[PDB]
GROMACS .gro file of C-alpha atoms in nm:
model
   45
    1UNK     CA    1  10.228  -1.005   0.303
    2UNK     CA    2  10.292  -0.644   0.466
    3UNK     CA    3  10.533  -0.702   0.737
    4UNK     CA    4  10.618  -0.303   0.777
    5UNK     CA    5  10.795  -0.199   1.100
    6UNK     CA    6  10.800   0.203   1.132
    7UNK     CA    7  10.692   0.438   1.418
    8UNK     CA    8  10.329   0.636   1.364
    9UNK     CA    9  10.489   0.941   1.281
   10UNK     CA   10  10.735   0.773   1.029
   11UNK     CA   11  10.516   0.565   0.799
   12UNK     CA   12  10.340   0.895   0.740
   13UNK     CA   13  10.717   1.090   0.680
   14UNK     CA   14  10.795   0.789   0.467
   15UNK     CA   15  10.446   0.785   0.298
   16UNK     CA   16  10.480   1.156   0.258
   17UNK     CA   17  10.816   1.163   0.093
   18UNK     CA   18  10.710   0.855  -0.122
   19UNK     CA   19  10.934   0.624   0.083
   20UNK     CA   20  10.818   0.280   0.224
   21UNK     CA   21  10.960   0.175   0.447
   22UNK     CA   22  10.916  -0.183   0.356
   23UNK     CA   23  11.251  -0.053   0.138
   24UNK     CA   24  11.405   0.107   0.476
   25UNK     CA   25  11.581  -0.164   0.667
   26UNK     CA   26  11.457   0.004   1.030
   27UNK     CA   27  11.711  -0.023   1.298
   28UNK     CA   28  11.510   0.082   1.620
   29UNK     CA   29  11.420  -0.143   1.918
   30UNK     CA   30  11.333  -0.395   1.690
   31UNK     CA   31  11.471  -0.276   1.378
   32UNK     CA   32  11.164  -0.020   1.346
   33UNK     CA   33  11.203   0.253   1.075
   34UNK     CA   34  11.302   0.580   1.244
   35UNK     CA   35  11.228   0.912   1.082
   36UNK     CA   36  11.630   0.952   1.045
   37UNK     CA   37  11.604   0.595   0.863
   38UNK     CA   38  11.365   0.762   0.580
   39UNK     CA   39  11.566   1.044   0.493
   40UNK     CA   40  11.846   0.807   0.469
   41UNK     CA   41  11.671   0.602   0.205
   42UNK     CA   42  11.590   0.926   0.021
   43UNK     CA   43  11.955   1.071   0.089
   44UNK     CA   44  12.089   0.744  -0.041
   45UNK     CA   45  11.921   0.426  -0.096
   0.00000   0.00000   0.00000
């Protein structure tokens, strides 16, 4: 099961800064992970 909702750009922030963002609760259009949404997790979790 991989239900992971982040934009192209983000999944490769989150994957960069060891962040998944099946951890990030995503809160764009559709509750997609934003880029803002990984540092979050990272600058708070």
């Amino acid at each position: 099961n991989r239900r992971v909702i982040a934009m192209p750009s983000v999944r490769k922030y989150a994957r960069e800064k060891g962040v998944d963002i099946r951890l990030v609760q995503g809160t764009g259009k559709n509750g997609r992970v934003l880029k803002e949404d990984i540092d979050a997790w990272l600058a708070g979790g």
